[PDB]
Amino acid sequence: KAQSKRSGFCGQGTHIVSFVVNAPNGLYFMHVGYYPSNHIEVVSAYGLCD
Amino acid sequence: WTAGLSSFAAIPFAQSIFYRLNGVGITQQVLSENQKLIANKFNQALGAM
Amino acid sequence: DVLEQDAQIDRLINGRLTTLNAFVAQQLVRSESAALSAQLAKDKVNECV
Numbered sequence: 001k002a003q004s005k006r007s008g009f010c011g012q013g014t015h016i017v018s019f020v021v022n023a024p025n026g027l028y029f030m031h032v033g034y035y036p037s038n039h040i041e042v043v044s045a046y047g048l049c050d
Numbered sequence: 051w052t053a054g055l056s057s058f059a060a061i062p063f064a065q066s067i068f069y070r071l072n073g074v075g076i077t078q079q080v081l082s083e084n085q086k087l088i089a090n091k092f093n094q095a096l097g098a099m
Numbered sequence: 100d101v102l103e104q105d106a107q108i109d110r111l112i113n114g115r116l117t118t119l120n121a122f123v124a125q126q127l128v129r130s131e132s133a134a135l136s137a138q139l140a141k142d143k144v145n146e147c148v
Contacts, residue, residue, distance in 0.1 A: 007142065007145035007146045008145060040056065
């Protein structure tokens, strides 16, 4: 019904949408999985205090 | 870090505990920065275990 | 005597194989329980840790 946005019970990585189709003697699921596949180090600050 | 989701971070573990504690219990930064032995209290429990 | 001994061997073989069948069945049940517990463990690590 909705994007899981939580622990990956469904497709590995963040799951945008999941589509379910009947399988012989069962149900087959076809989730969509997002994988970054690249990581670049960026120095970051915790906003600012004024 | 509570703000970071599924992302790498470079913060001390004690700061990470504070972010999780702030989400778990609504304690203001002034309240959290009082005795400053809150992490030490966790260490005492870990030592007892 | 050998002829009587062969008859004794037969029943002993039948008893041993049935006991092995029960042992294998218990191991199969344990493996199915392990698969369920491993799935629970993976969910627990992602949800809590």
